[PDB]
Symmetry: C5
Subunit: 242 residues, 5 copies
């Protein structure tokens, strides 16, 4: 059976990110049909609970790319697909147009490992989030240029150490997670963040804009997906006028 | 009730900018439904008056990106979202397609502070708008390249002094406001202007095109949002044939 | 009140260019409904005759960007908006989707004045169009890179003298008008041409491609709007099957 | 009747290329409505037979840009427009969305003339197509960068001689026609090919990719339009389920 | 009846790749119409079995570009078109919007041939897939810059040898097929992969990102099409809620 804490903290897990706009004729449906949408959403999540985990987020009003985001994990990529196929059959899903959908895999540390960069690795492992419960999500797709990948392992390691040094301080108020996507999407990475403090988040990304690694980005957003963390019930009720 | 002056003049405020096109079938609604739209807009703005302020602008006819613009402020990012969610549930909102939606935060001065640049700071602080009441809004999203951000604080200060020296004169007939967006949108900044004098505004932007800072812009518009300042009542009536 | 000759020949005039596609369901309306459209167009133009002038052009079949173009002038930018708001309320307008809308202002000569460049200015001043009445319009939005604007006044003057030298001969065959748009649209200029001779026009633009100024263009079309000059009556009848 | 052979083989002729998608609701129309489409197409082509010639091609299934292509020639650009206006008012036309529409003019040889390049000109003039009747069409819009146009006539001639030398051999199985578009569309040229042998065509374009001229292309496709040559009757019946 | 193994393993075969989104109103159709779709799909595949082969893949939930992919082969390009024209006439086809459609031809080895690169060719020739049956498909369109094509045959061979050396090891768990598209689509190549191991596939693409060839890519995806391999019956049933 699928265990949430394990799926969120181990290598080899597929993360499937999808954003949707609600079609204009959804709100033209009868109120009873929309009232029932929330229970249909919970049933489809529950149907797939032995294979996948699902998180929901409200993006309407915080960007033009979408109205909501789904983050789905499984050790089986096709299982994420099957969940999303069934989601699209729900009442809300049927009235949802997909606007972005990126997949990636979690991996062991390539750079800031105990073996390769022990001091920074220690700071990474010892950090503790100490703020209020996160309220916001940010997803940033990232793609690096050919020049980056053609640099040596040693050159890249140095640039990732420079990425890490000024950002460790933000682990008190930003949670991060990295997925790897080269060959599976038009991105090298999907980056995922949770925070209560968007002022801090803006400062964190400014810090990263200022390092030489940033000279290699050909995608660093587009979209930058900003949303609020919501339960599935609240999300679907909100989008259904319920 | 949220204090408008405080929200417009203090540092940690979220600005939420959204532009919409009105769908073709809105004007096919019965006249009674369109007549009721202005009061619905007033009620939703009223509902959220404890947490947000709202400004409306008519962009139809002055660009192809949108028909209207909303600028929403709050100290709580999610409160701006909640207002926009409720806006979208109004009759006009139901028939509105979002075309752009950018958010940012207000900050203390990074460069032209009393400490760092006292003469320019004094000129900035003492400037007074003296023209007739503004009639037009311009919103310009801005994003700077990695080379900009990788420059030193001193190198960047010098370029911002050069931005400021030739433009202080325009504070007699252009009002300006800066928001910071890196990590929250696909922009580093949202810039907001009010004026009665678009000839002056064109000259102002030409002056800024001519300085070295401009060599670093990867976004400087796209869209350049141009509109007229309108009350919410007049905006909604105009778009409703009322 | 508005005077066509004054508005077309003086500095400080706003030019508002807008292109539209006619939605497919317009032609599904009964002929009697479409028959009324032409009179409505003339009435809205007449309603605004004290503040604006209006020209109409048919673009269907000469590009994929639009079916028609409106060029509207006024000394008040908001008056151009008011006209287009009312245009959108007409039968044809309500079935029109805007595809591009750019505004700009007419200005005194910056470069090829008698003061700064007397020989070329004499050629500009003495040229006379001497072909048949123009049949075609071309609108070309232009934007120049930061490197252009960062060049000195003298460097830019030389490049504009090189723009002018090989093109003066085409004033026999082509009428031109320049508008300035930096800060008001995602363009530095809107350029407007009338001609009966598209062979000559092609040769003219080839001559401009060959000069060093052209190395600074980041927009030089996109869209290149090509149309035929038509009365408002003929335009609306044509798009209405009448 | 217009002289087809003359329009296809002389300078100063306008070529008008347009591609369209058939709307999803076309095939929902009653069969009797669709059955009438083919004769309507024939009638509009006949109506304009004094001023224009028309060729039809099926692109559905060979690219995502369009379902069909029209190639229209006339010595009067406005006459090509008039035909396309009337085409759009036909049953199939009313259910067609234009996706690309580019115009250009045929010209005398600029480079590989008897004057400038007599050996290659002789090769060009004496070449004969000798393969199976063409079955396929390819249209490739081309635009060259400012650096190309800024090169001297002599520099450009050399590069075009290098274009021509390795491609003359393909005149046995590829028919070519060049149109000039600068100023009339977002392209410098429209290039048109007919062949039965797409393997040969692929090899021809690879040969051209390999020459220094290709370093100057900023458009070389986008779209690359690939279709099959069809009669108007077969084209319309195919797209109408008849 | 076309010979599938021959079409999949010989030079001179046309590959036609198309992706589609299912329109929102498909699921609004009565159940009986959707239940009939799978047989209609099998009938059209059977109708064309003398000339083409067809493979089907489910892409919904693994990217935002499409809901399904068709890969069609024939020695006659027009036969692939004829199949796709009849596909679009089926119930599912009629409710499908094409999102990408690229064609190409299979060719003999240009670089890693026995004559040009015998050691690497031997490794290519001896390599055997030995993992579990593939479950996933990846399609990556590739286009190389003018600088690549302008390099000599020897220079390009060296870069393709470097492509091949680190990737031979993946032939145990990734199946590959190359098609050539210059002149036939806005791509130089279409690349096609089958695997059960997306972790391996990500590592494979990372290896290729790191070589100098990658500095020449102007397209390497866009879209990167990720799907699951499915029978036609299962594909159509899944998209029909059956
Ligand atoms: C919140 C504080 C942050 C910390 C402490 C941090 C730390 C790290 C570390 C340690 C790695 C290396 C992983 C490995 O060895 O495989 C890494 C990789 C990465 N980080 Fe961050 N990061 C943070 C925020 C961000 C943000 C905000 C973004 C994007 C905007 C980002 C984008 C990435 C990317 C794309 C990689 C992969 C780099 C590569 O493999 O080339 N990080 N980060
Ligand atoms: C109206 C007269 C103008 C004046 C006096 C002016 C002045 C300034 C000043 C003093 C700052 C520095 C803020 C700080 O220290 O943090 C600044 C920043 C900025 N201004 Fe302006 N400005 C004007 C117009 C404009 C216009 C028209 C634009 C856009 C077209 C613009 C875009 C910006 C941007 C993007 C920043 C942030 C720069 C950075 O942090 O890298 N400004 N401006
Ligand atoms: C028809 C013959 C043409 C002549 C004689 C001509 C002449 C001129 C002159 C004298 C100026 C300088 C105006 C000033 O001093 O402020 C100018 C500016 C300009 N022209 Fe033309 N022009 C012609 C055609 C065109 C065409 C076809 C285009 C675009 C394709 C074009 C684009 C522009 C632009 C963008 C400017 C503004 C340049 C700047 O301020 O940096 N012109 N032209
Ligand atoms: C089929 C064999 C081909 C031959 C023999 C051939 C030959 C030529 C010749 C002789 C010219 C010069 C015309 C002049 O002097 O004005 C020319 C121009 C041109 N050709 Fe081709 N060509 C062939 C195929 C192609 C293809 C496949 C393309 C596009 C992919 C192409 C694109 C062009 C363009 C854009 C020009 C105009 C160049 C300029 O004026 O700068 N040609 N070709
Ligand atoms: C799975 C292991 C892989 C192996 C062993 C491999 C091997 C090869 C070989 C031997 C060639 C030369 C074909 C010839 O001589 O004509 C080739 C060409 C090519 N491969 Fe791969 N490849 C693999 C994976 C990939 C992947 C994953 C991609 C794309 C992301 C890719 C893209 C290409 C392209 C575009 C070409 C044509 C290059 C050109 O002609 O310039 N390959 N590959």
């Amino acid at each position: 059976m699928a265990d949430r804490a394990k799926l969120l903290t181990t290598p080899g897990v597929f993360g499937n990110f999808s954003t949707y706009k609600v079609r204009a004729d959804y709100m033209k449906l009868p109120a009873a049909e929309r009232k029932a949408a929330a229970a249909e959403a919970q049933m489809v999540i529950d149907k797939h609970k032995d294979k996948v985990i699902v998180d929901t987020y409200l993006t309407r009003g915080l960007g033009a790319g979408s109205d909501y985001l789904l983050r789905v994990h499984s050790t089986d990529m096709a299982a994420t697909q099957a969940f999303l196929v069934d989601w699209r059959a729900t009442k809300l899903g049927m009235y949802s147009d997909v606007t972005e959908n990126l997949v990636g895999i979690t991996k062991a540390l390539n750079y800031i490992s105990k073996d390769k960069s022990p001091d920074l690795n220690a700071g990474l492992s010892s950090a503790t989030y100490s703020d209020s419960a996160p309220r916001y999500v940010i997803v940033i797709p990232v793609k690096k240029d050919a020049a980056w990948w053609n640099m040596s392992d040693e050159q890249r390691l140095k640039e990732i150490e420079v990425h890490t040094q000024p950002t460790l301080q933000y682990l008190v108020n930003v949670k991060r997670k990295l997925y790897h996507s080269t060959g599976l999407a038009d991105a090298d990475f999907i980056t995922y963040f949770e925070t209560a403090d968007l002022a801090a988040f803006n400062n964190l990304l400014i810090a990263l804009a200022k390092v030489p690694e940033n000279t290699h980005h050909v995608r660093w957003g587009n979209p930058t997906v900003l949303g609020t963390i919501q339960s599935a019930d609240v999300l679907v009720k909100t989008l259904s006028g319920m």
